[PDB]
Amino acid sequence: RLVQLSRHSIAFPSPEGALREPNGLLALGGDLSPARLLMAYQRGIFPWFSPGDPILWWSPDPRAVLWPESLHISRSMKRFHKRSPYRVTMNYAFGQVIEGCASDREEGTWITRGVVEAYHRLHELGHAHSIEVWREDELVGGMYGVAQGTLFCGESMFSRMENASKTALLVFCEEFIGHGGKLIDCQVLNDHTASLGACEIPRRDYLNYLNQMRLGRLPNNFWVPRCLFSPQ
Template sequence: MKDAMNRRRPWVSPESAGPDGLVGVGGDLRPSTLVRGYAEGVFPWFNEGDPILWWSPDPRAVIELDGIHISHSLARTIRSGRFRVTANCAFGDVIRGCADCRTDGTWVTRQMIEAYEELHRLGHAHSVETWVRTESKGTEQKSDSLEGWTLAGGIYGVSVGGLFAGESMFFRVSDGSKVALAALVERLKTCGFELFDVQMRTEHTTRMGATDIPRKDYLRRLREAVKKTNVRFA
């Protein structure tokens, strides 16, 4: 029984982890394992061909939902309507875009792509996409159609209760990921999420308002956030 429990939960309690944040090695990426990990403040991060590594860094980076930084130039871009924003319309394309670009240092392996696509099918993983209109010879497209639009960027992550854990983002058109991140924050606020975890700060997320908080504070807020059962990423 103990060995079986170790297979289901291949990490130690984050409270007992060192400052580097490594809490476990091995295990699997089954949906139940991933959901439990995020609910306990743990996420996988490893290179192709390596064992699965589980992390709970200290400090932990978050974006406060009322504290996102939107520059004047980005606000103008958003108002211009240049980008079309959708949610959960191209999850597979977004996660593969992140794997191809790796703009934030994240290594999105083939194993992780398969695992998170399954999470998406089960309603736990979500994406926000931005699109730009391609040159069109024909007539105006229907408002609900993406025909004539090209994927410009996106972000994906995992939801558990009132937690949204952002995993990675990418862009193919300048500002494509920034607009996606801004749209995601607005959606999280509207849907009643409490905690937006971005794991570790990058230059990009720092400019958008990411801050570090002690792991113990993150875990305390996480325990409250995941108790919310009426939150839906809609």
């Protein structure tokens, strides 16, 4: 049971054979090369592990997910946004966002130099993207993830100013839906993400969605770096 990946192949074991507790633990080892990483997202698997541990790959059951249209926005958040003090941009500073998440210290601590360089390559190659939230000239939050057709896999987010990451997601969902976005993978569910409207569906359901959506498509220029929302 369980399995060590080899530097030779880039193949992964079927997600369904993953462990029950720790939920999702499927395999360890391998590397974080673009090819293997990309392969993992294709198969509905993601790497996650603390510093000093060998690479760990997961595919939990259920799976956290967020339907873009079901994003919950408090009435005070709408009030806030209507007169928002933030500027949201896309792919303006991926390196700064991932670094921001990597400092969140509650658990951005798993984002080691190696993981950071790993998703940097995916960003250069055009698979990973980031949404930045600015307060005047300072980056006060954001989120990044691996795009996959009409599905988007959230990796992490951070906030240095009140409601920052909320608007990051708010603005993202609008843009996302408006252009054919269909689902947001939230990996593992937690309090913040759950209050935002995230929910859990069966691993096999998420996997199906994955297969139907990875084939989808968004405008050929959806991810080019641009501003999505400007303050007043």
